[PDB]
Amino acid sequence: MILKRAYDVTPQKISTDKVRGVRKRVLIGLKDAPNFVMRLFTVEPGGLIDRHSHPWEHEIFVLKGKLTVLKEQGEETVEEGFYIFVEPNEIHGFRNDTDSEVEFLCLIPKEGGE
Amino acid sequence: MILKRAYDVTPQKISTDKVRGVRKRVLIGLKDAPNFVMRLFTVEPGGLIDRHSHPWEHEIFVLKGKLTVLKEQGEETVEEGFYIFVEPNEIHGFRNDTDSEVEFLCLIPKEGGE
Ligand SMILES: [Mn+2]
Ligand SMILES: [Mn+2]
């Protein structure tokens, strides 16, 4: 049994073509878990995970702040206490339109990576 | 994409010998999920999920309050922002030793039910 403070995990700041202003923490990863993985994402004010898709699902829980969710033909801003399920191959992305950091847990099957 | 307020999902109170002072909400259940499910548990002050084991893992994230984790040979109390991975067949239980409600997300592979 691993019991850990999520904040104590070293984050990877993520800077790509599609991602900026985002830190990722892998809480429970591929070496720990037989089936799925748990990450914690922090998005800085104005941070972006642009639209993309992949052949595996996301189960997400919004932990802090107002999270803007990008969809194929629209967006929806939700907040802390919402859960989100993205089906395999469904176009999605995220953005922080607020002036404070937003946090969300994101879980994916091990096929998806980590 | 499902986007919903967790608190809007119908809670199942449980009042039995081994599991009491608990409310369970299935956020992403077996009709929605190809691989694993997402539940939210609220534990009232003094509530209890007694020690047990089963042949599937738990991945857990503590959302609010101070949660006491019962282990084979001990106990460890963690706070919101902590995560817990319980290995398959590992003895585990939970208790709320505080005077306020505790909330945690709990996910298991679909093999484990709901
Ligand atoms: Mn994605
Ligand atoms: Mn259990």
Asked if residues A49 and A102 have their Cβ atoms less than 8 Å apart, the reply is no
Q: B85–A57: do the CB atoms touch at under 8 Å?
A: no
Quoted resolution (Å)? 1.6
Q: How was this structure determined?
A: X-ray
Cα of B111 to ligand 1 centre, how many Å? 24
Strands A102-109 and A92-95: unpaired
Distance CA B81, CA A83 (A): 17
CATH number at residue B84: 2.60.120.10
Quick one: which of B9, B10, B28 has its CA closest to B110? B28
Whether A27 and chain B come into contact, CB under 8 Å, resolves to yes
Cα of B36 to ligand 1 centre, how many Å? 17
Distance CA A28, CA A40 (A): 10
List of long-range contacts for A86-92, beta carbons under 8 Å, 24+ apart:
A86/A57, A86/A58, A86/A60, A86/B1, A87/A57, A87/B1, A88/A54, A88/A55, A88/A56, A88/A57, A88/B34, A89/A53, A89/A54, A89/A55, A90/A53, A90/B1, A91/A51, A91/A52, A91/A53, A92/A51, A92/A52, A92/A53, A92/A58, A92/B1
Phi-psi region of A30 (alpha: psi -120 to 50; beta: other; left: phi over 0): alpha
* Domains: count for chain B: 1
Binding residues of A for Zn(2+): 52, 54, 58, 92
Cα of B45 to ligand 2 centre, how many Å? 20
List chain A residues with CB under 8 Å of B28: 59, 83, 85
Q: B107–A36: do the CB atoms touch at under 8 Å?
A: yes
Nearest CA in chain A to B74: A1
Q: B57–A33: do the CB atoms touch at under 8 Å?
A: yes
Binding residues of A for Fe(3+): 52, 54, 58, 92
List chain B residues with CB under 8 Å of A57: 33-35
Quick check: helix, strand or coil at residue B6? helix
Domain carrying residue B112? 1-114
